[PDB]
Symmetry: C3
Subunit: 33 residues, 3 copies
Amino acid sequence: EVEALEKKVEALELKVQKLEKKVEALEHGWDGR
Amino acid sequence: EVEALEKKVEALELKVQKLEKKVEALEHGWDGR
Amino acid sequence: EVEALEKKVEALELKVQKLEKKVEALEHGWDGR
């Protein structure tokens, strides 16, 4: 169902963005990490 | 191909869940991390 | 739009691969991590 896939992709995109932020934080040692 | 996209989304969802777990582990310092 | 969803999935797949690499690096302590 394309409409439902679209929702899942949109959710994954935000999830991946948030992971990218946390992982760049850990890699760079931002804020005592 | 919607059917193939569906499989890729379903795989990504599990991959993102597993990443979310590991990243929350690293952020929280679970188990000596 | 399936064509656009396909592009987003393909981008997410690479993003998730790269995250998987960085996270396995952090988990394993590769290279001083």
